[model samples]
Target: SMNPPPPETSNPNKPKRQTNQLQYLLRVVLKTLWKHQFAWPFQQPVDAVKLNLPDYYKIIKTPMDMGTIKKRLENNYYWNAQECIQDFNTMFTNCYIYNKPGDDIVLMAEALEKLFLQKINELPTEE
Candidate 1:
C-alpha cells in the first residue's frame, strides 16, 4: 500500500472561517463612506427652501454617479467619503422620510449629522 500523504497544515494568516459575503459587502460600503468624510446634506437649506430642481439634481446625481462608478469598478468599487455623504444627505433630505415640528426639524437635522459622523468614525479607512 502507498504511504499516506502528509497532513494539511492551516495558515495562521488565514481567517478561522470564511467571512460572510453579506457582512463583507456591508463592511466595504461602510468603510468606503467612512474613509471619506461623508455627511448629510444641508438641512437648513432644505427646511428653508425645500427640495427644488437644483437640490433634486444634487441629491440624485450622487447615487447615479456612484452606481456608474460601482459598475465600472466592478470588483473594486471603491467610493469616496464625500460622494457617500452627498448621497446620504440627499436621500435623507428629499426622500420625505422625516417630518416633524420646526424645533424637531432642526433636531432631526442635527441627529442625522451626528449619526453619519459617528458611523464614519467607527469604520476603517480605505486601502
Candidate 2:
C-alpha cells in the first residue's frame, strides 16, 4: 500500500490533557525559581540606564526575564513546557553574554540555571 495511515484519534482529549498538565507543572517550577535569592537580578527587566549598561539593547536581541515569563504563563502565551523552558534558558544566557567572568550576576545566573534544570526535571512527564 502506497497510502499512509491517518493519525489515531483514539483519545482526542489525551493531547489536551498533556498540555494542561504541563502548564500547571511548569508553573510550579517557575514559582520556586522566582522565590530563590539568586532570582532577584532576573525577576524584572534590567534598568539599563541606572545600571549603566547603555549597550545592553545593542547586545541582546531577545530579553527574557522572570516577570515577563510569569505574565506570559498567566496569559497562556506559551505553546508548551519546552517553550517556557527555553525562555528561562534565554534569560540565563543573556546574563552570561552581558557579564564578564567572575561577575556576581553571572554567578547568580549559573546558580539559578542549575536550580531550574533540577526542578524542571522533577516535574513528571506526560508519558
Best by lDDT: 2
Candidate 1 lowest-lDDT run of ten = 1-10
Which residue pairs come into collision in candidate 2? none
Candidate 1 residue-wise lDDT, 24-111, digit = tens: 3346543353344332343112322343334443333322222332332333333344433555555455434344446554564555
TM-score on alpha carbons, each prediction: 0.31, 0.79
After superposition, candidate 2 runs with Cα above 4 Å error: 1-18
- RMSDs, each prediction? 18.6, 12.1
**Model 2 accuracy (lDDT, Cα):** 0.73
Residue 25 displacement (Å), model 1: 9.6
CA lDDT scores, all candidates in order: 0.39, 0.73
> Candidate 2 on 56-101: residue-level lDDT in tens?
8778777778887776676556557777688888889989998898
